[PDB]
């Protein structure tokens, strides 16, 4: 019926970020972490059904900067061009009083994959519960982003998803409430 | 911070058609977002993107001992891996979620915007249709298409602009790979 | 089973 699989990978200087992970179908399978330099599936389950060796994903990524080394002095040292992302915050299901959950904040259209995103409720961040995912790749090849966040619908409780990214010249605000 | 930045991307694509049958294997090197040189399963050989890959894809080419793996990788690379994978990707199968609810707004004068949500499901392959006392309801309904929440799941709202008259009843119907049989919500 | 990775070639320069 027609399916697609991409093994996507890429490395950011001067900053040294370096992305491996699987995608399938537009969702993501796992990525490799690359400080623990252990394999993250995004769905606990994946992991007992399937494995991956973290080391031969180091391996790449190794060579992905060794060509980045290369391919800057081909370009003449020409730099990337920001391109600010298009932030929609929204929830996971129907929203309902006292009833658990979860808010996102999908930060998409973007490049290069290095953005700053925070989570506010009245005023003051979050940081409780929260959880997100690594740059997703795009068909177009600029980036993609989710944030998590859980918590129970209120009457009086105003959500704001900030981000910040060199593209745009100023943070970046999506407000949320009830209503 | 605001020091250039240099980008490079690498894209290792499996292409299937009717299941792991037909298939076409991808190695895409990009530099920012320029693809410059890729291997097409369907080629054989590197091929230049820009000029910024010439150089690239007449040494790659040169070993052939190279060219061999990647001209075996639809069956070494794709087609392996989709047998793998194919328990938990291509047969996923979850049930969607649809509850029928009045907009929490109203953006349109006197007519009341029925909702109807349909979360949590996979694949993305789905419909939603609107009925009223017996009949579709194919014009005055539009929808926010297909949603990607992230975590392998998806929603989709499909509103629809109605003229409030009691006595009427509202049902929102839904198909799905992981249905048994249409799904559907009523609201009074 | 296991997923295998593709490689990445390296250029020269």
Redesign the interface.
Known sequence: EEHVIIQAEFYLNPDQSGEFMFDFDGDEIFHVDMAKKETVWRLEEFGRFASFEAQGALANIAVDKANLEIMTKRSNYTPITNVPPEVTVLTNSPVELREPNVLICFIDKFTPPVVNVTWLRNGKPVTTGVSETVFLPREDHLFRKFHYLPFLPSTEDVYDCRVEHWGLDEPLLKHWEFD | DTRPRFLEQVKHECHFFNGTERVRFLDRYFYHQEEYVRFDSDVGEYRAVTELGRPDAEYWNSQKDLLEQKRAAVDTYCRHNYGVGESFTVQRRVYPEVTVYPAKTQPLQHHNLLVCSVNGFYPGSIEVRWFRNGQEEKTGVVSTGLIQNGDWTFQTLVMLETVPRSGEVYTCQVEHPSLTSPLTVEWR | ?13
């Open positions: 089973r296991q997923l295998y990775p593709e490689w990445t070639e390296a250029q020269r320069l």
